[PDB]
């Protein structure tokens, strides 16, 4: 009786939200940006190939100086690369080799990683002893760690396969806030540029916008037909793009609370692993299962170019903060740095 | 053209590269085994004979190092992390023979043996384990022998025309699991009958792993 009545009210509320989004859908982003000229053909060359990982690369993250990056492989090694020289700055042996994510702190003093061991390990890069040591092991998730991102040297957000995201106080080792509401494994998270919000994509094909300080879900974004594997905020923080196993990328707007544009092609039938934006946000770069990275025109939904330089899955990618280059990691154990030439 | 510190930084990277190769060679001598199976299937008893997330077991038998990984604690979606185990030497699958007549506790109407068959079929025919051999352990053979006399095998298999002898009953179950394999050419299934008092289980794994390693070496050397 009471349970049946309540679940009927949820359906009425869902229709109310769907009607509200349709009311403000006066135009389409495609119609708005039809007049502007296309970006043309984007040609990028492999400037660097980072060799040394002996297994599948699962994650990479640029440092904020746009020169150092950290990559994770399931050979149990975290490696920090000098991308300008291809020099290896550090090689961090992992206690558990089943790593799925890695993060570089914005300060550059810490890196984080974790996988099937259900632990987010924080590594101190600046020690008087001259070696990288574990400073914290964040336990508390009951599923695998899928993504992690530093807010500062003391705060980090983790998404897990136990359907929850958590905000951690690194100094005390305790999760201050727990973000619940996903009905599937949360696969990714992205921080807003002001680090007041973050979006997460789960295997329930939905993206939720979370308030870091308040600790609740502000908005829920649906439209994908399969698990979301990747998510990335727009550079101004007012939009985000997702990548799913249904071979599509969608651009959702925070303020309009709805999808604005879909980025898919008939030839593309493989899942999407990673998404990122260029510095101005005009380009959406997506890594795919078909061994390629497709550069999209964000405004016009045109495939601007292809980065074809890997013989296995493109597992991760990232664009520098200055926008100078894009790094692609792959299951073939190589990282490549790309940018164009005049 | 490099500066004094740049040359030192390049030399540090070479030192790191040397240690990465040594770690890769050391990790290449380890046999990685993925341990799978249903609950109450002798999966924990096998680990005892072999002596919060993934559980890793290390043991050495005749100058060969084995790394056995148990992922029974992972209650998340299997497909999101099962590719992480692509490239293991072999998969160890544990099946309780005594659970042929028992009913799964959760469903209360599904036979446990059929539940193991569904788990075996998905893992064996998974796209990430096309070339991965499977070591099949059929535990509780002594308890299965006792249950056969009281309970015929026809309960589990309605289309079973065989007798109630232990040898015929056990062989029929072995063939049913091997018939679930669709990649007969690319992979091979090794089946063994284990008990609580058995001590040859480590020898069977070593023999099955050595056969798998040699076949991979022949494929790498061009003979296969």
């Amino acid at each position, epitope marked *: 009786s009471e349970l049946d009545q309540l679940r009927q009210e949820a359906e009425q509320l869902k229709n109310q939200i769907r009607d509200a989004r349709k009311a403000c859908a006066d135009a389409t982003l495609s119609q708005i940006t039809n007049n502007i000229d296309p970006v043309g053909r984007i040609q990028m060359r492999t400037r660097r190939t980072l060799r040394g990982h002996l297994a599948k690369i699962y994650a990479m993250h640029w440092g904020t100086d746009s*020169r*150092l990056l950290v990559s994770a492989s399931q050979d149990g090694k975290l490696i920090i690369w*000098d991308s300008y*020289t291809t*020099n290896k*700055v*550090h090689a961090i042996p992992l206690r558990s080799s089943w790593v799925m994510t890695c993060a570089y702190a914005p300060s*550059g003093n810490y890196v984080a990683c974790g996988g099937l061991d259900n632990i987010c390990s924080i590594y101190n890069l*600046k020690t*008087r*002893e*001259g*070696n990288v040591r574990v400073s914290r092991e964040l336990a508390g998730h009951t599923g695998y760690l899928s993504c992690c991102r530093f807010l500062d040297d003391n705060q980090i957000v983790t998404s897990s396969g136990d359907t929850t995201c958590a905000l951690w106080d690194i100094e005390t080792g305790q999760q201050t806030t727990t973000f619940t509401g996903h009905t599937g494994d949360v696969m990714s998270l992205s921080l807003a540029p002001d680090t007041r919000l973050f979006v997460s994509g789960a295997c329930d094909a939905s993206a939720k916008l979370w308030d870091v300080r308040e600790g609740m879900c502000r908005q829920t974004f649906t439209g994908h037909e399969s698990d979301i594997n990747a998510i990335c905020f727009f550079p101004n923080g007012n939009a985000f793009a997702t990548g799913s196993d249904d071979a599509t990328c969608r651009l959702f707007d925070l303020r309009a609370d709805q999808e604005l544009m879909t980025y898919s092609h008939d030839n593309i039938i493989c899942g999407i692993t990673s998404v990122s934006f260029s510095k101005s946000g005009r380009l959406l770069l997506a890594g795919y299962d078909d061994f390629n990275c497709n550069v999209w025109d964000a405004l016009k939904a045109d495939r601007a170019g292809v980065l074809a330089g890997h013989d296995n899955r493109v597992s991760c990618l990232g664009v520098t903060d200055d926008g100078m280059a894009v790094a692609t990691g792959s299951w073939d154990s190589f990282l490549k740095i790309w940018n164009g030439s005049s | *053209t490099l*500066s*004094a*510190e*740049d*040359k*030192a*930084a390049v*030399e*540090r990277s*070479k*030192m790191i590269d040397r240690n990465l190769r040594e770690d890769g060679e050391k990790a290449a001598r380890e046999v990685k085994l993925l341990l799978l199976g249903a609950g109450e299937s002798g999966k924990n008893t096998i680990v005892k004979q072999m002596k919060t997330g993934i559980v890793e077991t290390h043991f050495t038998f005749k100058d060969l190092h084995f790394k056995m990984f148990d992922v029974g604690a992972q209650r998340s979606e299997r497909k999101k992390w099962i590719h992480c185990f692509e490239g293991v030497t072999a998969i160890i699958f544990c099946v309780a023979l005594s659970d042929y007549d028992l009913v799964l506790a959760e469903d209360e109407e599904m036979n446990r043996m059929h539940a193991s068959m569904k788990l075996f079929d998905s893992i064996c025919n998974n796209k990430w384990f096309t070339d991965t051999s499977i070591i099949l352990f059929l535990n509780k053979k002594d308890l299965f022998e006792e249950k056969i006399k009281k309970s015929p095998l026809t309960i589990c298999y309605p289309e079973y025309a065989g007798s109630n002898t232990y040898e015929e009953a056990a062989a029929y179950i072995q063939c049913q699991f091997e018939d679930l394999n669709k990649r007969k050419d690319t992979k091979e299934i090794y089946t063994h009958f284990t008990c609580s008092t058995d001590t040859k289980n480590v020898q069977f794994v070593f023999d099955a792993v050595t056969d798998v390693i040699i076949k991979n070496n022949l494929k790498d050397c061009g003979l296969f």
Partner: single-chain antibody, 231 residues
Framework: DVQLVESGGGLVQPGGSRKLSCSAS????????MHWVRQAPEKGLEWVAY????????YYADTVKGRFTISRDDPKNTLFLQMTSLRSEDTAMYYC??????????????WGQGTTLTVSDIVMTQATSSVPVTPGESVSISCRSS???????????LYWFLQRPGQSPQLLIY???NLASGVPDRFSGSGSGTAFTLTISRLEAEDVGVYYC?????????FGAGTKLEL
């Protein structure tokens, strides 16, 4: 804590041989390159030798090449300096210096206490030998180089050290602008090309000492004469 203890120094006859040891504790010794730097009594610093991490690269100053041998024992965390044919020119305090090299590292950050031995090229100029100072007032120290210390990679390999009376040198500024860990922000390094300035805002009693500018553009590493601050 990070420690570097030197031993084996003492009074030796001219033409003799002596073995200096530097035992390291509290840090990953095998990861650091090591230098020997000596300082003659009432004189400035003089670089002696260098052995890299992994023992692959070894450098010597011309004045000691062929007579000194530098070696390390990574399992024992010991740094060695085998000296032969010792001359009266070798009478100095020999310092053991650790230095790690990667992008953004701070070489020459920790020095040992030193051991005293008594026997019976880019030019770095610090013309001002001494500067009378008062607490709370801003002081600037100038250094010059015969060659441009700015490399084509954008780094300017100029270092600033402070040797307080009775103490080993400590790193203040590395690569001409960066502030070493544990150094107050009042110190600031400014330079261009061949001319460099170390500015000390709100001078305190602890800042009193000799300041050395070192170039790390190429070997041999050379020090300035040193500028002394006195009250």
């Amino acid at each position: 804590d990070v420690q570097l203890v030197e031993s084996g120094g003492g009074l030796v006859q001219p033409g003799g041989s002596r073995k200096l040891s530097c035992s390291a504790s509290g840090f990953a010794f095998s990861s650091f390159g090591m230098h020997w730097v000596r300082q003659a009594p009432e004189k400035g610093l003089e670089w002696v030798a260098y052995i890299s991490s992994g023992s692959g690269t070894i450098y010597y100053a011309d004045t000691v090449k062929g007579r000194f041998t530098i070696s390390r024992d990574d399992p024992k965390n010991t740094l060695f300096l085998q000296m032969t044919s010792l001359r009266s020119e070798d009478t100095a305090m020999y310092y053991c210096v650790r230095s790690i090299y990667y992008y953004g590292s701070s070489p020459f950050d920790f020095w040992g206490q030193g051991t005293t031995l008594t026997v019976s090229d880019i030019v770095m100029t610090q013309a001002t030998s001494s500067v009378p100072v008062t607490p709370g007032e801003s002081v600037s120290i100038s250094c010059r180089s015969s060659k441009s210390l700015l490399h084509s990679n954008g780094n300017t390999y100029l270092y600033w050290f402070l040797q307080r009376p009775g103490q080993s040198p400590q790193l203040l500024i590395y690569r001409m602008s960066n502030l070493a860990s544990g150094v107050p922000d009042r110190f600031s390094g400014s330079g261009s090309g061949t001319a460099f300035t170390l500015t000390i805002s709100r001078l305190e009693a602890e800042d009193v000492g000799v300041y050395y500018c070192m170039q790390h553009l190429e070997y041999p590493l050379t020090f300035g004469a040193g500028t002394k601050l006195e009250l």
